[PDB]
């Protein structure tokens, strides 16, 4: 059956790639993304952010919104070849908008520098480098090749120069989740050019397993701070869910080791097995604390790991209270339950696996 | 009878040109446009937009407001010779205001360039080139002749240089409706100077019939993107209504072919044949989705095509809930149902046909 | 008797000059104008507009507020010699405040220039030139003589250089009412210096009788636009009332010709002959449309023309619903019915005739 | 007895100097003035006006607030020697704050000049010159001696240059009350240095008795305007009360002459002799019109003239409806009835007489 | 456990011995560190989102950051597993303290463009103590150059003044702000083996002559060197803060006045279960003025080892503030004063300013 308040079955979402068609509700999300002049997020390459003003997206989170849209569009390209030209066009726009000062300008306003790419700031330039790669996989266009080579060399050189494996975001803030994106961006560059930038990944997976994970609980600590050597002593569900999802595309064995322990630690099954919600940290019964993204990031992880049961449970918790409706063949939510809501449900519904995106066949 | 909340019969609007007089409610709209110091839209040539601030007109849509007023005024000049001097004065102001940075400045704010005319941006300069032509047909004034020749040569050269037939708006955004205006502006230049810029029209009508239209449904796709070759895979009522209305003035056979199919696809007759409302896309029962202009643009198409029944039905849907009143011989609407409301009802009530404007007798 | 909500009889207002005393309510208006530190309009020469902020006076209309106060004060000087020194002091302040950028700055904000006097802008500099003259008639002070000569020569030279008789306001906007003030300012300069700048008046009265008036209806068209020669094809009561009032001081025969026709066209007597209200244009029953000044400007015209009956009727319409009260010997209105309310009722109550102000005896 | 809503008896206020102690409520006012970090008026020398922002004090009136606090503090120094060091410290701050541009900057914003001291502006620099003097009488400090000599010489030279006796405020605005302060400041300089700047006072008292006072009513006209010779033809209670209070310190005979006539003209005793309120002008029954300070300035005059009965009557009108309370040994009013409320009640409660302040013994 | 309290007074006082913070202190550290962008200790940036959300007035941000820092230095001493974290938070505390949002009132008031060069001890005293506590906790020489520069400015300015200490605003002398400056010299001396603290004896002599009422054990509000004036009101928050800091330099001084301070200002109520603190004399009203007398006295009670008064004050302060833990993170629905979560944090963990001085190295 179709549980109440849902738009399509878990069977339907997982069958999209095989049926070579997106579900009607994913098509209605692409319509929200592309249809109305000026105010749709993928209307033009311009430095126009009307779509994010209307959703009340905080400035600091727009970079994550654009990136999550981009990762979803790369899966749409793989699902339906008739939509691959459209997905490529949207990715062109995603890259253009990602480079606008509205998106990266927090870096300058906080006093960290005038150039968002030259040093640090992996939370921005990791996502940008992955988007450059996914654009070229999807389209075969060399439009951003020069910028892509420049940013990839910056990421490689900065990893090589650091005593810890990886790159900080704000100075003296190290986040595994933001590093995972940077490392995946090196895999994609290597797939495009036959280079071996991804070689640095082994050292990184060794490093994050020493100080930054609780292996019994299958959960990463919130953050690391190289100057003091401090690890914030709380484990984080959203941090772990995101990291495991991306690492599965580079070292599947790593994510398969920790995933069942991650679920025991954080996932609460309820309503006689029909629903699930995710605790953000230990020592609490409360779901979706902190940034409120544990359930939505776990939905993406469930998709990456092929876990239909947990996917169905999480989507039954997340989607119905958001009261989705289709108006003029376009998807809207009356009560989005978190930041980045339509972005993450879109991405989770279409996600083909970061592994599959790496191996994407040419046009 | 006169249906309730309407100001004049469909017979009266269609009879204006023959009776050589505008209806009282059209005269009351011209009064709103011209009467009150400072706050009327056609008060002066200055870069003053108080009239648009009071209507809460979004910046990006002011260019369309001024242009629609201009197209209406050109029909007023043809209807009533006693109003032709007034119409000419308002068109002078329309051109002046259209050149103010408040109107075109989105082009610079989005990062596309400091000059709105030199390349691309046909959604602005197409309307501006048509207004230059209509000003000169109405008045016989050579005030803008030099600017008109310069912009016409830019449009001609840009068409000749493109591998696709026509000109983009934002870079890599191609809209048939905005191109239709550019092509009509070449017909008007040709009428004024005995040139053959309109020769490029055949190639354009061939091109938009290959990839950009669904001929069974008589409906254009939303947009085309030359870099990717992508066509947004949704059909658009407002896009089609506007395009067919303008093309009818250049190749009437083209619009006559698609019009009946356009009506089957999008038009919903309701209230026992008294009213009509227009769906914006396929796969929905919802009227006036998207930008919300399908009904109002179809009202203009009905006028262009001489379809009194559909004109009457659409106006019975649009005008009454907007609660029009005449106060001190000046027309206002308490609840305009869309953007550009008074502009499009004005234009639809007076529209003599784009063909007739081309053949306008001298003063 | 004294109708309800009125403060004094029409007989009393018309008798003030003969009794050599203003009525107590006019004295209470002078107190509003002069009494309270900082917030009274005539507190100081400074560029301080607290009095206009408290009345919510729109920026563009402050120049008209100051001017109307000034015209009233010139009549106060003529009515009561004991108040002539005070009236002169208020006129000093009126001239100073008129020259503040808060007052003329719209000229620069609209993009027309950085100097409000060098060319055009007669709606500002006409009023300023008349105020310079009235200040010197009232006081005998040579304080502004140099500025007065400079501005009078600018107005004279600009009239001489124009192919039409007079001067525009905004570029290509000609208003008879604003020109009437400029021409009267030349009569006043001539009275002060024995010059013949007023000679240009004959050509102006000839010109405004050809194209700008409807002689059967005794009413001026809204405006004239010299580039196109277009006349906005609506007649205006406030335009006509103001123009006839000022022209009566230069060519009384002209205003006497049109006044009875003006009243038939626009004035509605109601409440069994006790009240009157003025239509702003033709083809309406609605009173005080447009800027909403037709009744108040007609009150001043009735005073200028010596029409006690119409004066009484208009004041019975205007004053009572405004709910005037005297607090601490100072006049206030709870519900002013229009812009410039206290200014125009003040001016109409004291107005000695523009002819009489011209012939003002020395101090 | 102690009337209801009062904090201390008139007997207690008048006995403070003799008992060498301020009343508890005066001590609680000094606490409001000095206690809370940042937001108390006498917190620091800085250009910080948080205390005046919280009381919503209009910018133009801050100069008067600081000055009235200063005059009160000079009496506190005389009443209680244990508080004289504190009073001196507060006067140091009063002088510093008085010199901040927030306080004098209206002079520049109005266009009268960039220097508030060089010419005119006696409403500011009169108060500043008196404060320099009172600071030095109270403390013996030579901190401001150089500035004090410079400003005293400016005042002396400007009096000597004027054809009328005294100095204008805004150009062409002469106020007796603001002049009275300037003249008293010369008496204080003379007491400090054995000079004879006060010699100019005889000519000033002769001048203000000719044109500026109504001798029958014992009341000064609102203001004088030297360029026109105009006297605003209304008498002013607050103007007269302030002037007589200050003149009593220089020529007691002058104030004793007019005081009984001032009370007949303006003071209304009510509630069977228990209360009094003061009319601001003639030809009204309304109390505290205009700036609303007639009652509070008359309270200070009653104190200066030793009139316990009128002091008690006015304080019974002013204090109770203001709903005073002491919280944490600090005085507040829930409903202050006028501008400068706590400042003027403070000053009136402590005022030792301007004569006594002149004769202040050294520390 | 009284209702609306989160932990017993026994639990807070036992933290150092148990080498663990209580769960509610851990939940305060989580509020301080957990959520991206909006948590106060998220980054070194000149970003004040955390203080915008708490509606912290500009002039008081400097005190918020400093009180967090003093609490974190005690956390380092209580739980060695949290000492690296506390060091990281102190790094951020110092960075944020140097942002113009924090010190910029000095320039807006017209006193100067440099907040460190002269005067302004209410700012640079706290900053100099934070530089010291950062280096005690971490061993990091990151700020050593700035710390030496500011310490030498404070020493030279004390040496130049005819009164013992340094003004805040020009001609405003506050004992509480000076107490911090002097303690910052003790910490510099502990780090470098210098004798800047030598100036302390003259300072304790001076504040006992004119600035205290010894019968009432209470300091006057402020002193003004140009006039020699002492504002003639005694202040509870002024005294509580000063006695707490002086206890770390001259314990005998604070032990002399503490019992008299309590008689003068502290009101025990609700049958001995609660206490609240009068801000001045001649009033029955509690927590007048800046409203910090009760919260500063809670810190003093902790410094002086007075469990009974600590329990009484916390029973007055915490329950009406309606604390709750959501997702292992502490919030208060109705904070009863400025700097509420900052001062309850500091009072719950405070090991004594003496103990912080003697902090064992990394």
PDB file of C-alpha atoms in Angstrom, chain E residues 73-245:
ATOM      1  CA  UNK E  73      39.580  27.686  33.334  1.00  0.00           C
ATOM      2  CA  UNK E  74      37.875  25.883  36.316  1.00  0.00           C
ATOM      3  CA  UNK E  75      36.479  23.170  33.924  1.00  0.00           C
ATOM      4  CA  UNK E  76      40.150  22.513  32.847  1.00  0.00           C
ATOM      5  CA  UNK E  77      41.090  21.954  36.538  1.00  0.00           C
ATOM      6  CA  UNK E  78      37.957  19.822  37.366  1.00  0.00           C
ATOM      7  CA  UNK E  79      38.137  17.292  34.422  1.00  0.00           C
ATOM      8  CA  UNK E  80      41.454  16.651  32.580  1.00  0.00           C
ATOM      9  CA  UNK E  81      39.512  14.908  29.729  1.00  0.00           C
ATOM     10  CA  UNK E  82      37.822  18.368  29.122  1.00  0.00           C
ATOM     11  CA  UNK E  83      41.041  20.457  29.445  1.00  0.00           C
ATOM     12  CA  UNK E  84      41.795  20.363  25.661  1.00  0.00           C
ATOM     13  CA  UNK E  85      38.168  21.494  24.976  1.00  0.00           C
ATOM     14  CA  UNK E  86      38.415  24.287  27.632  1.00  0.00           C
ATOM     15  CA  UNK E  87      41.677  25.437  25.971  1.00  0.00           C
ATOM     16  CA  UNK E  88      39.979  25.569  22.535  1.00  0.00           C
ATOM     17  CA  UNK E  89      37.043  27.594  23.995  1.00  0.00           C
ATOM     18  CA  UNK E  90      39.574  29.990  25.659  1.00  0.00           C
ATOM     19  CA  UNK E  91      41.344  30.465  22.251  1.00  0.00           C
ATOM     20  CA  UNK E  92      37.931  31.537  20.826  1.00  0.00           C
ATOM     21  CA  UNK E  93      37.121  33.661  23.931  1.00  0.00           C
ATOM     22  CA  UNK E  94      40.376  35.664  23.393  1.00  0.00           C
ATOM     23  CA  UNK E  95      39.735  36.033  19.584  1.00  0.00           C
ATOM     24  CA  UNK E  96      36.146  37.277  20.059  1.00  0.00           C
ATOM     25  CA  UNK E  97      37.229  39.624  22.905  1.00  0.00           C
ATOM     26  CA  UNK E  98      39.516  41.442  20.385  1.00  0.00           C
ATOM     27  CA  UNK E  99      36.682  42.064  17.829  1.00  0.00           C
ATOM     28  CA  UNK E 100      35.496  45.716  17.493  1.00  0.00           C
ATOM     29  CA  UNK E 101      31.878  44.675  18.259  1.00  0.00           C
ATOM     30  CA  UNK E 102      33.169  43.969  21.835  1.00  0.00           C
ATOM     31  CA  UNK E 103      35.504  46.977  22.555  1.00  0.00           C
ATOM     32  CA  UNK E 104      34.025  49.497  20.034  1.00  0.00           C
ATOM     33  CA  UNK E 105      31.980  51.429  22.690  1.00  0.00           C
ATOM     34  CA  UNK E 106      35.416  52.936  23.695  1.00  0.00           C
ATOM     35  CA  UNK E 107      35.619  54.648  20.232  1.00  0.00           C
ATOM     36  CA  UNK E 108      31.835  55.440  19.880  1.00  0.00           C
ATOM     37  CA  UNK E 109      32.004  57.322  23.314  1.00  0.00           C
ATOM     38  CA  UNK E 110      34.936  59.471  22.000  1.00  0.00           C
ATOM     39  CA  UNK E 111      37.691  58.112  24.353  1.00  0.00           C
ATOM     40  CA  UNK E 112      40.078  56.823  21.591  1.00  0.00           C
ATOM     41  CA  UNK E 113      40.576  54.498  18.552  1.00  0.00           C
ATOM     42  CA  UNK E 114      42.854  52.025  20.490  1.00  0.00           C
ATOM     43  CA  UNK E 115      41.129  50.155  23.383  1.00  0.00           C
ATOM     44  CA  UNK E 116      44.475  49.072  25.033  1.00  0.00           C
ATOM     45  CA  UNK E 117      46.854  52.145  24.848  1.00  0.00           C
ATOM     46  CA  UNK E 118      45.531  53.980  28.001  1.00  0.00           C
ATOM     47  CA  UNK E 119      42.715  53.622  30.604  1.00  0.00           C
ATOM     48  CA  UNK E 120      39.778  51.260  29.782  1.00  0.00           C
ATOM     49  CA  UNK E 121      40.795  48.744  32.534  1.00  0.00           C
ATOM     50  CA  UNK E 122      37.163  47.424  32.497  1.00  0.00           C
ATOM     51  CA  UNK E 123      38.038  45.949  29.022  1.00  0.00           C
ATOM     52  CA  UNK E 124      41.821  45.288  29.020  1.00  0.00           C
ATOM     53  CA  UNK E 125      41.952  43.940  32.621  1.00  0.00           C
ATOM     54  CA  UNK E 126      39.539  41.114  31.602  1.00  0.00           C
ATOM     55  CA  UNK E 127      41.485  40.608  28.292  1.00  0.00           C
ATOM     56  CA  UNK E 128      44.872  40.411  30.159  1.00  0.00           C
ATOM     57  CA  UNK E 129      43.462  37.817  32.647  1.00  0.00           C
ATOM     58  CA  UNK E 130      42.042  35.783  29.683  1.00  0.00           C
ATOM     59  CA  UNK E 131      45.460  35.801  27.878  1.00  0.00           C
ATOM     60  CA  UNK E 132      46.985  34.378  31.100  1.00  0.00           C
ATOM     61  CA  UNK E 133      44.274  31.730  31.721  1.00  0.00           C
ATOM     62  CA  UNK E 134      44.546  30.590  28.044  1.00  0.00           C
ATOM     63  CA  UNK E 135      48.317  29.981  28.472  1.00  0.00           C
ATOM     64  CA  UNK E 136      47.968  28.295  31.954  1.00  0.00           C
ATOM     65  CA  UNK E 137      45.339  25.893  30.510  1.00  0.00           C
ATOM     66  CA  UNK E 138      46.988  25.087  27.103  1.00  0.00           C
ATOM     67  CA  UNK E 139      50.747  25.946  27.383  1.00  0.00           C
ATOM     68  CA  UNK E 140      50.265  27.718  23.975  1.00  0.00           C
ATOM     69  CA  UNK E 141      52.484  30.817  23.266  1.00  0.00           C
ATOM     70  CA  UNK E 142      49.949  31.963  20.542  1.00  0.00           C
ATOM     71  CA  UNK E 143      49.122  35.248  22.444  1.00  0.00           C
ATOM     72  CA  UNK E 144      52.406  35.544  24.497  1.00  0.00           C
ATOM     73  CA  UNK E 145      53.594  38.699  22.572  1.00  0.00           C
ATOM     74  CA  UNK E 146      50.229  40.535  23.038  1.00  0.00           C
ATOM     75  CA  UNK E 147      50.074  39.289  26.697  1.00  0.00           C
ATOM     76  CA  UNK E 148      53.560  40.739  27.488  1.00  0.00           C
ATOM     77  CA  UNK E 149      52.648  44.061  25.722  1.00  0.00           C
ATOM     78  CA  UNK E 150      49.333  44.472  27.636  1.00  0.00           C
ATOM     79  CA  UNK E 151      50.889  43.408  30.987  1.00  0.00           C
ATOM     80  CA  UNK E 152      53.691  46.033  30.538  1.00  0.00           C
ATOM     81  CA  UNK E 153      51.056  48.736  29.674  1.00  0.00           C
ATOM     82  CA  UNK E 154      49.089  47.854  32.886  1.00  0.00           C
ATOM     83  CA  UNK E 155      52.317  47.837  35.031  1.00  0.00           C
ATOM     84  CA  UNK E 156      53.541  51.244  33.566  1.00  0.00           C
ATOM     85  CA  UNK E 157      50.087  52.866  33.963  1.00  0.00           C
ATOM     86  CA  UNK E 158      49.878  51.740  37.672  1.00  0.00           C
ATOM     87  CA  UNK E 159      53.446  53.109  38.229  1.00  0.00           C
ATOM     88  CA  UNK E 160      52.447  56.521  36.669  1.00  0.00           C
ATOM     89  CA  UNK E 161      49.198  57.031  38.717  1.00  0.00           C
ATOM     90  CA  UNK E 162      49.220  58.895  42.107  1.00  0.00           C
ATOM     91  CA  UNK E 163      46.323  56.576  43.220  1.00  0.00           C
ATOM     92  CA  UNK E 164      46.911  52.775  43.194  1.00  0.00           C
ATOM     93  CA  UNK E 165      45.385  51.309  39.974  1.00  0.00           C
ATOM     94  CA  UNK E 166      43.884  52.358  36.594  1.00  0.00           C
ATOM     95  CA  UNK E 167      40.677  54.180  35.509  1.00  0.00           C
ATOM     96  CA  UNK E 168      38.049  52.753  33.104  1.00  0.00           C
ATOM     97  CA  UNK E 169      36.386  55.749  31.362  1.00  0.00           C
ATOM     98  CA  UNK E 170      38.676  58.759  32.037  1.00  0.00           C
ATOM     99  CA  UNK E 171      38.182  59.910  35.718  1.00  0.00           C
ATOM    100  CA  UNK E 172      36.161  56.689  36.581  1.00  0.00           C
ATOM    101  CA  UNK E 173      37.915  54.282  39.044  1.00  0.00           C
ATOM    102  CA  UNK E 174      36.119  50.956  39.842  1.00  0.00           C
ATOM    103  CA  UNK E 175      37.676  48.586  42.471  1.00  0.00           C
ATOM    104  CA  UNK E 176      36.025  45.531  40.802  1.00  0.00           C
ATOM    105  CA  UNK E 177      37.681  46.243  37.364  1.00  0.00           C
ATOM    106  CA  UNK E 178      41.066  46.943  39.081  1.00  0.00           C
ATOM    107  CA  UNK E 179      40.807  43.600  41.026  1.00  0.00           C
ATOM    108  CA  UNK E 180      40.839  41.792  37.622  1.00  0.00           C
ATOM    109  CA  UNK E 181      43.860  43.798  36.375  1.00  0.00           C
ATOM    110  CA  UNK E 182      45.827  42.936  39.575  1.00  0.00           C
ATOM    111  CA  UNK E 183      44.861  39.227  39.341  1.00  0.00           C
ATOM    112  CA  UNK E 184      46.084  39.306  35.651  1.00  0.00           C
ATOM    113  CA  UNK E 185      49.550  40.357  37.025  1.00  0.00           C
ATOM    114  CA  UNK E 186      49.567  37.344  39.438  1.00  0.00           C
ATOM    115  CA  UNK E 187      48.888  35.036  36.417  1.00  0.00           C
ATOM    116  CA  UNK E 188      51.629  36.661  34.233  1.00  0.00           C
ATOM    117  CA  UNK E 189      54.078  36.208  37.203  1.00  0.00           C
ATOM    118  CA  UNK E 190      53.095  32.500  37.538  1.00  0.00           C
ATOM    119  CA  UNK E 191      53.808  32.055  33.766  1.00  0.00           C
ATOM    120  CA  UNK E 192      57.171  33.976  33.532  1.00  0.00           C
ATOM    121  CA  UNK E 193      58.634  34.201  37.123  1.00  0.00           C
ATOM    122  CA  UNK E 194      58.300  38.071  37.100  1.00  0.00           C
ATOM    123  CA  UNK E 195      57.219  40.280  40.106  1.00  0.00           C
ATOM    124  CA  UNK E 196      54.474  42.533  38.572  1.00  0.00           C
ATOM    125  CA  UNK E 197      52.191  41.362  41.469  1.00  0.00           C
ATOM    126  CA  UNK E 198      54.420  43.464  43.871  1.00  0.00           C
ATOM    127  CA  UNK E 199      52.082  46.460  43.135  1.00  0.00           C
ATOM    128  CA  UNK E 200      49.200  44.560  44.904  1.00  0.00           C
ATOM    129  CA  UNK E 201      50.192  45.507  48.561  1.00  0.00           C
ATOM    130  CA  UNK E 202      49.917  49.302  47.772  1.00  0.00           C
ATOM    131  CA  UNK E 203      46.530  48.654  46.023  1.00  0.00           C
ATOM    132  CA  UNK E 204      45.034  46.672  48.966  1.00  0.00           C
ATOM    133  CA  UNK E 205      46.252  49.499  51.349  1.00  0.00           C
ATOM    134  CA  UNK E 206      44.666  52.196  49.083  1.00  0.00           C
ATOM    135  CA  UNK E 207      41.207  50.525  48.604  1.00  0.00           C
ATOM    136  CA  UNK E 208      40.981  50.062  52.451  1.00  0.00           C
ATOM    137  CA  UNK E 209      41.585  53.855  53.149  1.00  0.00           C
ATOM    138  CA  UNK E 210      38.921  55.745  51.085  1.00  0.00           C
ATOM    139  CA  UNK E 211      36.953  53.156  48.966  1.00  0.00           C
ATOM    140  CA  UNK E 212      35.533  50.760  51.651  1.00  0.00           C
ATOM    141  CA  UNK E 213      33.162  51.102  54.635  1.00  0.00           C
ATOM    142  CA  UNK E 214      34.981  48.669  56.988  1.00  0.00           C
ATOM    143  CA  UNK E 215      32.086  48.403  59.585  1.00  0.00           C
ATOM    144  CA  UNK E 216      29.710  47.270  56.733  1.00  0.00           C
ATOM    145  CA  UNK E 217      32.368  45.311  54.723  1.00  0.00           C
ATOM    146  CA  UNK E 218      31.241  47.082  51.527  1.00  0.00           C
ATOM    147  CA  UNK E 219      32.927  49.167  48.791  1.00  0.00           C
ATOM    148  CA  UNK E 220      31.547  52.511  47.578  1.00  0.00           C
ATOM    149  CA  UNK E 221      30.229  52.490  43.976  1.00  0.00           C
ATOM    150  CA  UNK E 222      33.228  54.361  42.451  1.00  0.00           C
ATOM    151  CA  UNK E 223      36.113  56.865  42.900  1.00  0.00           C
ATOM    152  CA  UNK E 224      36.946  59.899  40.680  1.00  0.00           C
ATOM    153  CA  UNK E 225      40.615  60.976  40.972  1.00  0.00           C
ATOM    154  CA  UNK E 226      40.361  64.570  39.462  1.00  0.00           C
ATOM    155  CA  UNK E 227      37.847  65.644  42.250  1.00  0.00           C
ATOM    156  CA  UNK E 228      38.810  62.939  44.819  1.00  0.00           C
ATOM    157  CA  UNK E 229      35.015  62.233  45.063  1.00  0.00           C
ATOM    158  CA  UNK E 230      33.716  58.822  46.208  1.00  0.00           C
ATOM    159  CA  UNK E 231      30.091  58.194  45.145  1.00  0.00           C
ATOM    160  CA  UNK E 232      28.528  57.902  48.623  1.00  0.00           C
ATOM    161  CA  UNK E 233      26.506  54.647  48.046  1.00  0.00           C
ATOM    162  CA  UNK E 234      27.820  51.146  48.929  1.00  0.00           C
ATOM    163  CA  UNK E 235      27.331  48.476  46.205  1.00  0.00           C
ATOM    164  CA  UNK E 236      26.779  44.708  46.722  1.00  0.00           C
ATOM    165  CA  UNK E 237      27.777  43.608  43.155  1.00  0.00           C
ATOM    166  CA  UNK E 238      30.917  45.827  43.359  1.00  0.00           C
ATOM    167  CA  UNK E 239      31.877  44.270  46.751  1.00  0.00           C
ATOM    168  CA  UNK E 240      30.961  40.623  45.876  1.00  0.00           C
ATOM    169  CA  UNK E 241      33.111  40.669  42.692  1.00  0.00           C
ATOM    170  CA  UNK E 242      36.057  42.482  44.394  1.00  0.00           C
ATOM    171  CA  UNK E 243      36.119  40.169  47.476  1.00  0.00           C
ATOM    172  CA  UNK E 244      35.910  37.067  45.213  1.00  0.00           C
ATOM    173  CA  UNK E 245      38.992  38.158  43.173  1.00  0.00           C
TER     174      UNK E 245
END
